Amino acid sequence: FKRMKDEWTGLVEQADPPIRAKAAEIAVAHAHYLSIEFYRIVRIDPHAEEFLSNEQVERQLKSAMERWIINVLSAQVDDVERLIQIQHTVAEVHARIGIPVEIVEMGFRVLKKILYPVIFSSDYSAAEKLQVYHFSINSIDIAMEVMTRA
Amino acid sequence: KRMKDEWTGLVEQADPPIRAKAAEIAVAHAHYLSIEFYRIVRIDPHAEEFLSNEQVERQLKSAMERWIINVLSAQVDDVERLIQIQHTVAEVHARIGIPVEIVEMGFRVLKKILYPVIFSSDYSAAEKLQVYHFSINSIDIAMEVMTRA
Ligand code: HEM
Ligand code: HEM
Numbered sequence: 001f002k003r004m005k006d007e008w009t010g011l012v013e014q015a016d017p018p019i020r021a022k023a024a025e026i027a028v029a030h031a032h033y034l035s036i037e038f039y040r041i042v043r044i045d046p047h048a049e050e051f052l053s054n055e056q057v058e059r060q061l062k063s064a065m066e067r068w069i070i071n072v073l074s075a076q077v078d079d080v081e082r083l084i085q086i087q088h089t090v091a092e093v094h095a096r097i098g099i100p101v102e103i104v105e106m107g108f109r110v111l112k113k114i115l116y117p118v119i120f121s122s123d124y125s126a127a128e129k130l131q132v133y134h135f136s137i138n139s140i141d142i143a144m145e146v147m148t149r150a
Numbered sequence: 151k152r153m154k155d156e157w158t159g160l161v162e163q164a165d166p167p168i169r170a171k172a173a174e175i176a177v178a179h180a181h182y183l184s185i186e187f188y189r190i191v192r193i194d195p196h197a198e199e200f201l202s203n204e205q206v207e208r209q210l211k212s213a214m215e216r217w218i219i220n221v222l223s224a225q226v227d228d229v230e231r232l233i234q235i236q237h238t239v240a241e242v243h244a245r246i247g248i249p250v251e252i253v254e255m256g257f258r259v260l261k262k263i264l265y266p267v268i269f270s271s272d273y274s275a276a277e278k279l280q281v282y283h284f285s286i287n288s289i290d291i292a293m294e295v296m297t298r299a
Binding site (some may be wrong): 106125 | 275291
């Protein structure tokens with residue numbers, strides 16, 4: 001945990017404050033789309049659709065996915081410890097139900113894929129898009145590692 | 151089967167000069183990326199136990215260099231061959247007894263250390279964005295194929 005906290009903290013610190021601000025801006029403005037786009041693409045997969053069947057979970061997961069994206073992409077130094085606890089909780093939920101790891105990680109790949117066009121279509125410069133995308137990818141990756149290994 | 155189409159589509163939808171620059175970045179810095187991969191990875195105790203002796207080090211570094219170049223210089227015809235590689239690597243990791251969460255940790259390190267190399271290149275910011283995008287997606291799809299194999 002100590003090593004994970006330091007790395008995630010370092011990721012936020014080494015990320016330029018205007019870049020983290022723009023990443024947070026991208027998150028808040030498009031988290032709703034990213035969540036609903038995530039859900040349908042995932043459910044296309046037969047192995048994944050069996051877990052995303054009912055309407056109640058849909059409304060719950062979309063809201064939770066939206067909150068998750070906002071928390072991770074708008075992460076500050078103070079939020080690092082809390083974010084780690086969140087990934088543990090999510091890991092418990094996925095384990096409680098019995099959702100395979102390779103299916104969840106496929107979702108992370110889906111999430112990272114649909115995030116890029118949103119950043120690419122943003123009003124920012126090419127250099128800023130690169131740094132926002134870099135911070136976003138590393139943040140999602142470290143979050144995935146914490147969730148998986150928990 | 152779907153993995154082939156997605157990896158093929160990834161190469162097709164990627165601009166040829168971008169993939170060329172990504173391939174050039176690979177060839178020029180794969181040697182550094184491999185050694186940088188080793189140092190960061192061995193920090194983790196669970197991973198270090200597999201990377202103890204010097205002989206294993208040299209092979210993984212050599213294999214990492216070839217892997218990075220092959221994946222980033224991927225053409226459409228190479229896609230099927232690349233998938234076969236991931237199966238072979240997965241068998242090796244299984245033969246040794248390397249945990250899945252440990253291998254994926256290596257992928258994160260690889261994607262992490264790749265960014266400064268692309269960032270410090272002589273290309274434009276726009277080209278760097280697309281090269282980095284193609285590189286990340288290529289490594290991600292390769293990881294999923296390797297993991298499920
Ligand atoms: C194929 C991939 C995935 C599937 C099928 C899946 C499925 C589920 C299901 C069925 C639940 C239970 C929700 C409920 O009972 O109301 C859940 C919870 C949750 N998942 Fe996933 N999940 C996937 C990947 C992900 C990813 C990639 C993330 C974040 C990046 C994520 C974040 C969450 C969160 C935040 C919750 C709710 C946590 C809470 O309520 O405390 N999931 N997931
Ligand atoms: C912590 C992460 C990892 C560890 C500790 C690890 C360890 C190893 C070891 C000990 C070998 C065999 C070396 C030998 O027999 O001399 C090996 C094989 C190999 N690994 Fe990994 N590995 C990791 C992750 C990865 C990743 C992320 C990649 C690629 C992105 C990769 C690609 C390969 C390749 C291409 C080979 C050799 C394939 C062949 O001989 O045909 N490994 N790994």
